[PDB]
Amino acid sequence: QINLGPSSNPHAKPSDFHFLKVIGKGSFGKVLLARHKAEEVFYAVKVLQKKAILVLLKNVKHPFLVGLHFSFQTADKLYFVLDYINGGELFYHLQRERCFLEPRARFYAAEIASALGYLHSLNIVYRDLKPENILLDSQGHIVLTDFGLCKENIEHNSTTSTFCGTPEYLAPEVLHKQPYDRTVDWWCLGAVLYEMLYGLPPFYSRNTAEMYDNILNKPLQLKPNITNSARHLLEGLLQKDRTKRLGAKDDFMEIKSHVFFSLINWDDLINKKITPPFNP
Numbered sequence: 445q446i447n448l449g450p451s452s453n454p455h456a457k458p459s460d461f462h463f464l465k466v467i468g469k470g471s472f473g474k475v476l477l478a479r480h481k482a483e484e485v486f487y488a489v490k491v492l493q494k495k496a497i498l499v500l501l502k503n504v505k506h507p508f509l510v511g512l513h514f515s516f517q518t519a520d521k522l523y524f525v526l527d528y529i530n531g532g533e534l535f536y537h538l539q540r541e542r543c544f545l546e547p548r549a550r551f552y553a554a555e556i557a558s559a560l561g562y563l564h565s566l567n568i569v570y571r572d573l574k575p576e577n578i579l580l581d582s583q584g585h586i587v588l589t590d591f592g593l594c595k596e597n598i599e600h601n602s603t604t605s606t607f608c609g610t611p612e613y614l615a616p617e618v619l620h621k622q623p624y625d626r627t628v629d630w631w632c633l634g635a636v637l638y639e640m641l642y643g644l645p646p647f648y649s650r651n652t653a654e655m656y657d658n659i660l661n662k663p664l665q666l667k668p669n670i671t672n673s674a675r676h677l678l679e680g681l682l683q684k685d686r687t688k689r690l691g692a693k694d695d696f697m698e699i700k701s702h703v704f705f706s707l708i709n710w711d712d713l714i715n716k717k718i719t720p721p722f723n724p
Protein backbone atom coordinates (compact mmCIF):
# COMPACT_ATOMS: atom_id res chain seq x y z
CA GLN A 445 0.00 0.00 0.00
CA ILE A 446 1.18 3.48 -0.99
CA ASN A 447 0.18 6.63 0.93
CA LEU A 448 -2.02 8.80 -1.31
CA GLY A 449 -3.22 11.41 1.22
CA PRO A 450 -6.70 12.75 2.12
CA SER A 451 -8.12 12.19 -1.38
CA SER A 452 -7.64 8.41 -0.97
CA ASN A 453 -10.73 6.25 -1.50
CA PRO A 454 -10.43 2.77 0.11
CA HIS A 455 -13.69 1.63 -1.57
CA ALA A 456 -13.19 2.73 -5.18
CA LYS A 457 -12.15 0.13 -7.77
CA PRO A 458 -11.52 0.02 -11.57
CA SER A 459 -14.71 -2.09 -11.73
CA ASP A 460 -16.71 1.10 -11.04
CA PHE A 461 -15.69 2.76 -14.33
CA HIS A 462 -16.57 2.40 -18.03
CA PHE A 463 -13.46 3.31 -20.05
CA LEU A 464 -14.26 4.74 -23.50
CA LYS A 465 -11.08 5.99 -25.21
CA VAL A 466 -7.49 7.03 -24.48
CA ILE A 467 -7.17 10.76 -23.74
CA GLY A 468 -3.38 11.23 -23.59
CA LYS A 469 -0.13 9.50 -22.64
CA GLY A 470 2.21 11.69 -20.58
CA SER A 471 5.50 11.22 -18.74
CA PHE A 472 3.86 9.90 -15.57
CA GLY A 473 1.33 7.41 -16.99
CA LYS A 474 -1.76 7.37 -19.21
CA VAL A 475 -4.96 9.44 -19.09
CA LEU A 476 -8.24 7.81 -20.15
CA LEU A 477 -11.81 8.96 -20.73
CA ALA A 478 -14.06 7.13 -18.27
CA ARG A 479 -17.75 7.26 -17.34
CA HIS A 480 -18.67 6.26 -13.78
CA LYS A 481 -21.11 3.32 -13.96
CA ALA A 482 -23.23 4.56 -11.05
CA GLU A 483 -22.89 8.37 -11.07
CA GLU A 484 -23.31 8.45 -14.89
CA VAL A 485 -20.81 11.30 -15.42
CA PHE A 486 -17.53 11.61 -17.33
CA TYR A 487 -14.11 11.72 -15.64
CA ALA A 488 -10.54 11.94 -16.88
CA VAL A 489 -8.77 9.07 -15.12
CA LYS A 490 -4.97 9.08 -14.93
CA VAL A 491 -3.50 5.61 -14.35
CA LEU A 492 0.09 5.08 -13.19
CA GLN A 493 1.80 1.73 -12.54
CA LYS A 494 3.17 1.09 -9.02
CA LYS A 495 6.34 -0.51 -10.45
CA ALA A 496 7.29 2.90 -11.91
CA ILE A 497 7.83 4.57 -8.51
CA LEU A 498 11.24 4.65 -6.80
CA VAL A 499 4.52 11.77 0.93
CA LEU A 500 3.83 11.23 -2.79
CA LEU A 501 0.56 13.06 -3.61
CA LYS A 502 -0.20 16.62 -2.49
CA ASN A 503 -3.40 17.90 -4.14
CA VAL A 504 -4.03 21.65 -4.26
CA LYS A 505 -7.42 23.20 -5.04
CA HIS A 506 -7.61 26.33 -7.20
CA PRO A 507 -10.09 27.74 -9.78
CA PHE A 508 -7.31 27.26 -12.39
CA LEU A 509 -5.99 23.85 -11.32
CA VAL A 510 -7.79 20.64 -12.34
CA GLY A 511 -9.90 19.18 -9.51
CA LEU A 512 -8.96 15.84 -7.99
CA HIS A 513 -12.17 14.10 -6.89
CA PHE A 514 -10.60 10.99 -5.33
CA SER A 515 -7.78 8.45 -5.69
CA PHE A 516 -7.57 4.65 -5.36
CA GLN A 517 -5.11 1.79 -5.90
CA THR A 518 -5.00 -1.86 -6.96
CA ALA A 519 -2.14 -4.32 -6.43
CA ASP A 520 -0.39 -3.07 -9.59
CA LYS A 521 -1.84 0.32 -10.59
CA LEU A 522 -2.68 3.75 -9.14
CA TYR A 523 -5.78 5.66 -10.27
CA PHE A 524 -6.44 9.41 -10.12
CA VAL A 525 -9.98 10.59 -10.89
CA LEU A 526 -9.91 14.13 -12.32
CA ASP A 527 -12.30 16.64 -13.90
CA TYR A 528 -12.85 15.95 -17.59
CA ILE A 529 -11.86 19.29 -19.12
CA ASN A 530 -13.60 19.32 -22.51
CA GLY A 531 -12.88 22.81 -23.90
CA GLY A 532 -9.75 21.44 -25.57
CA GLU A 533 -6.05 22.28 -25.31
CA LEU A 534 -5.31 26.02 -25.35
CA PHE A 535 -2.63 25.53 -28.00
CA TYR A 536 -5.04 23.72 -30.30
CA HIS A 537 -7.00 26.98 -30.50
CA LEU A 538 -3.70 28.86 -30.92
CA GLN A 539 -2.73 26.73 -33.94
CA ARG A 540 -6.20 27.27 -35.45
CA GLU A 541 -5.76 31.05 -35.12
CA ARG A 542 -1.97 31.22 -35.77
CA CYS A 543 -1.63 33.58 -32.75
CA PHE A 544 -3.66 35.40 -30.05
CA LEU A 545 -4.60 39.07 -29.74
CA GLU A 546 -3.04 40.79 -26.71
CA PRO A 547 -6.21 41.11 -24.59
CA ARG A 548 -6.90 37.42 -25.32
CA ALA A 549 -3.31 36.45 -24.46
CA ARG A 550 -3.22 38.61 -21.32
CA PHE A 551 -6.35 36.88 -19.98
CA TYR A 552 -4.82 33.40 -20.31
CA ALA A 553 -1.41 34.56 -19.04
CA ALA A 554 -3.11 36.19 -16.02
CA GLU A 555 -5.05 33.05 -15.04
CA ILE A 556 -1.90 30.92 -15.29
CA ALA A 557 0.05 33.61 -13.42
CA SER A 558 -2.32 33.61 -10.43
CA ALA A 559 -2.26 29.81 -10.14
CA LEU A 560 1.55 29.83 -10.16
CA GLY A 561 1.67 32.62 -7.58
CA TYR A 562 -0.74 30.77 -5.29
CA LEU A 563 1.35 27.58 -5.45
CA HIS A 564 4.53 29.50 -4.57
CA SER A 565 2.76 30.93 -1.49
CA LEU A 566 2.34 27.32 -0.35
CA ASN A 567 6.00 26.64 -1.26
CA ILE A 568 5.08 24.59 -4.36
CA VAL A 569 6.87 24.92 -7.71
CA TYR A 570 5.14 23.83 -10.94
CA ARG A 571 8.59 22.90 -12.34
CA ASP A 572 7.59 21.95 -15.91
CA LEU A 573 4.69 23.94 -17.38
CA LYS A 574 3.94 22.71 -20.92
CA PRO A 575 1.34 23.60 -23.61
CA GLU A 576 0.00 20.05 -23.09
CA ASN A 577 -0.57 20.98 -19.44
CA ILE A 578 -2.76 23.94 -20.42
CA LEU A 579 -6.45 23.40 -21.23
CA LEU A 580 -9.60 25.52 -21.45
CA ASP A 581 -12.78 24.39 -19.68
CA SER A 582 -16.31 24.23 -21.15
CA GLN A 583 -16.66 27.96 -20.45
CA GLY A 584 -13.20 29.10 -21.56
CA HIS A 585 -11.17 29.44 -18.36
CA ILE A 586 -7.59 28.18 -17.97
CA VAL A 587 -7.23 24.75 -16.36
CA LEU A 588 -3.81 23.33 -15.50
CA THR A 589 -3.49 19.53 -15.44
CA ASP A 590 -1.00 19.31 -12.55
CA PHE A 591 -2.76 18.00 -9.43
CA GLY A 592 0.17 17.29 -7.10
CA LEU A 593 2.09 14.12 -8.04
CA CYS A 594 5.65 14.23 -6.67
CA LYS A 595 7.42 14.09 -10.04
CA GLU A 596 10.96 13.70 -8.64
CA ASN A 597 9.94 10.13 -7.69
CA ILE A 598 8.70 8.63 -11.00
CA GLU A 599 10.92 6.55 -13.34
CA HIS A 600 10.38 7.67 -16.95
CA ASN A 601 12.31 8.14 -20.22
CA SER A 602 13.11 11.85 -20.55
CA THR A 603 15.13 11.13 -23.73
CA THR A 604 15.01 13.99 -26.26
CA SER A 605 14.73 13.55 -30.04
CA THR A 606 17.10 15.10 -32.59
CA PHE A 607 14.50 16.96 -34.69
CA CYS A 608 11.03 18.10 -33.60
CA GLY A 609 11.07 17.51 -29.84
CA THR A 610 8.09 17.44 -27.48
CA PRO A 611 7.00 21.07 -26.94
CA GLU A 612 8.44 22.17 -23.59
CA TYR A 613 10.08 25.28 -22.15
CA LEU A 614 13.41 24.41 -20.52
CA ALA A 615 14.83 27.37 -18.60
CA PRO A 616 18.59 28.09 -18.82
CA GLU A 617 19.05 26.84 -15.23
CA VAL A 618 17.23 23.57 -16.01
CA LEU A 619 19.58 22.99 -18.96
CA HIS A 620 22.57 23.47 -16.64
CA LYS A 621 20.63 21.04 -14.39
CA GLN A 622 20.35 23.25 -11.31
CA PRO A 623 17.59 22.72 -8.67
CA TYR A 624 14.12 24.08 -9.43
CA ASP A 625 13.17 27.24 -7.57
CA ARG A 626 9.98 29.28 -8.07
CA THR A 627 11.58 31.48 -10.77
CA VAL A 628 11.50 28.58 -13.25
CA ASP A 629 7.71 28.90 -13.45
CA TRP A 630 8.05 32.57 -14.40
CA TRP A 631 10.28 31.64 -17.35
CA CYS A 632 7.61 29.14 -18.42
CA LEU A 633 4.89 31.78 -18.09
CA GLY A 634 6.95 34.15 -20.26
CA ALA A 635 7.51 31.40 -22.80
CA VAL A 636 3.78 30.57 -22.89
CA LEU A 637 2.94 34.23 -23.54
CA TYR A 638 5.71 34.48 -26.17
CA GLU A 639 4.27 31.50 -28.06
CA MET A 640 0.72 32.88 -27.72
CA LEU A 641 1.75 36.15 -29.39
CA TYR A 642 4.31 34.86 -31.90
CA GLY A 643 3.08 31.37 -32.84
CA LEU A 644 6.23 29.47 -31.84
CA PRO A 645 8.17 29.01 -28.56
CA PRO A 646 11.04 31.40 -27.77
CA PHE A 647 14.45 30.46 -29.25
CA TYR A 648 12.70 27.81 -31.40
CA SER A 649 14.52 25.65 -33.94
CA ARG A 650 13.72 22.51 -35.91
CA ASN A 651 16.97 21.12 -34.48
CA THR A 652 16.56 20.47 -30.74
CA ALA A 653 20.26 20.94 -29.95
CA GLU A 654 20.23 24.25 -31.85
CA MET A 655 17.18 25.27 -29.80
CA TYR A 656 18.97 24.62 -26.49
CA ASP A 657 21.96 26.57 -27.83
CA ASN A 658 19.68 29.55 -28.54
CA ILE A 659 18.09 29.48 -25.06
CA LEU A 660 21.55 29.69 -23.48
CA ASN A 661 23.55 31.94 -25.80
CA LYS A 662 21.38 33.83 -28.32
CA PRO A 663 19.92 37.18 -27.12
CA LEU A 664 16.12 37.42 -26.86
CA GLN A 665 14.87 39.03 -30.06
CA LEU A 666 11.29 40.23 -29.85
CA LYS A 667 9.67 41.07 -33.18
CA PRO A 668 7.46 44.17 -33.63
CA ASN A 669 3.62 44.04 -33.61
CA ILE A 670 3.40 43.68 -29.83
CA THR A 671 2.87 46.52 -27.31
CA ASN A 672 5.64 48.04 -25.16
CA SER A 673 4.09 46.53 -22.02
CA ALA A 674 4.15 43.09 -23.67
CA ARG A 675 7.72 43.76 -24.86
CA HIS A 676 8.86 44.79 -21.37
CA LEU A 677 7.19 41.83 -19.65
CA LEU A 678 8.77 39.28 -21.99
CA GLU A 679 12.18 40.93 -21.52
CA GLY A 680 11.62 40.56 -17.77
CA LEU A 681 10.22 37.02 -17.72
CA LEU A 682 12.65 35.59 -20.28
CA GLN A 683 15.78 36.73 -18.44
CA LYS A 684 18.41 33.99 -18.74
CA ASP A 685 19.86 34.91 -15.34
CA ARG A 686 17.28 33.80 -12.76
CA THR A 687 18.62 36.32 -10.21
CA LYS A 688 17.67 39.10 -12.66
CA ARG A 689 14.39 37.53 -13.80
CA LEU A 690 11.04 39.20 -13.11
CA GLY A 691 9.64 37.66 -9.93
CA ALA A 692 13.03 36.96 -8.36
CA LYS A 693 12.80 39.37 -5.41
CA ASP A 694 9.03 39.54 -4.78
CA ASP A 695 7.63 36.61 -6.83
CA PHE A 696 3.99 37.02 -7.95
CA MET A 697 3.74 40.63 -6.74
CA GLU A 698 6.24 41.55 -9.48
CA ILE A 699 4.05 39.94 -12.15
CA LYS A 700 0.73 41.03 -10.60
CA SER A 701 1.78 44.70 -10.53
CA HIS A 702 3.30 44.72 -14.04
CA VAL A 703 2.08 47.34 -16.53
CA PHE A 704 0.99 44.63 -19.00
CA PHE A 705 -1.51 43.31 -16.43
CA SER A 706 -2.77 46.79 -15.49
CA LEU A 707 -6.24 46.05 -16.89
CA ILE A 708 -6.50 42.87 -14.80
CA ASN A 709 -8.68 42.88 -11.70
CA TRP A 710 -7.05 39.89 -9.99
CA ASP A 711 -9.91 39.60 -7.49
CA ASP A 712 -12.46 39.25 -10.29
CA LEU A 713 -10.12 36.94 -12.21
CA ILE A 714 -9.90 34.22 -9.52
CA ASN A 715 -13.63 34.73 -8.90
CA LYS A 716 -14.17 34.14 -12.65
CA LYS A 717 -16.04 37.44 -13.08
CA ILE A 718 -14.20 38.47 -16.26
CA THR A 719 -15.97 36.53 -19.02
CA PRO A 720 -13.46 34.59 -21.18
CA PRO A 721 -12.66 36.28 -24.54
CA PHE A 722 -13.36 32.99 -26.31
CA ASN A 723 -16.09 30.39 -25.73
CA PRO A 724 -15.40 26.76 -26.82
Ligand SMILES: O=C(O)Cc1ccc(-c2c[nH]c3ncc(-c4ccc5ccccc5c4)cc23)cc1
Pocket residue numbers: 467468469470471472473474475488490510526527528529530531532533576577579589590
Ligand atom coordinates in the same frame (compact mmCIF):
# COMPACT_ATOMS: atom_id res chain seq x y z
O1 LIG B 1 -0.44 12.59 -18.73
C1 LIG B 1 0.24 13.52 -18.33
O2 LIG B 1 1.44 13.38 -17.71
C2 LIG B 1 -0.11 14.96 -18.45
C3 LIG B 1 -1.58 15.16 -18.40
C4 LIG B 1 -2.27 15.50 -19.55
C5 LIG B 1 -3.64 15.68 -19.51
C6 LIG B 1 -4.32 15.53 -18.32
C7 LIG B 1 -5.75 15.74 -18.24
C8 LIG B 1 -6.38 15.76 -17.02
N1 LIG B 1 -7.71 15.98 -17.24
C9 LIG B 1 -7.94 16.10 -18.58
N2 LIG B 1 -9.14 16.32 -19.10
C10 LIG B 1 -9.09 16.39 -20.43
C11 LIG B 1 -7.97 16.27 -21.23
C12 LIG B 1 -8.12 16.38 -22.67
C13 LIG B 1 -7.12 16.02 -23.55
C14 LIG B 1 -7.29 16.13 -24.91
C15 LIG B 1 -8.47 16.61 -25.42
C16 LIG B 1 -8.65 16.73 -26.78
C17 LIG B 1 -9.84 17.22 -27.28
C18 LIG B 1 -10.85 17.59 -26.42
C19 LIG B 1 -10.67 17.48 -25.06
C20 LIG B 1 -9.48 16.99 -24.56
C21 LIG B 1 -9.30 16.87 -23.20
C22 LIG B 1 -6.75 16.04 -20.63
C23 LIG B 1 -6.74 15.95 -19.24
C24 LIG B 1 -3.62 15.19 -17.17
C25 LIG B 1 -2.26 15.01 -17.21
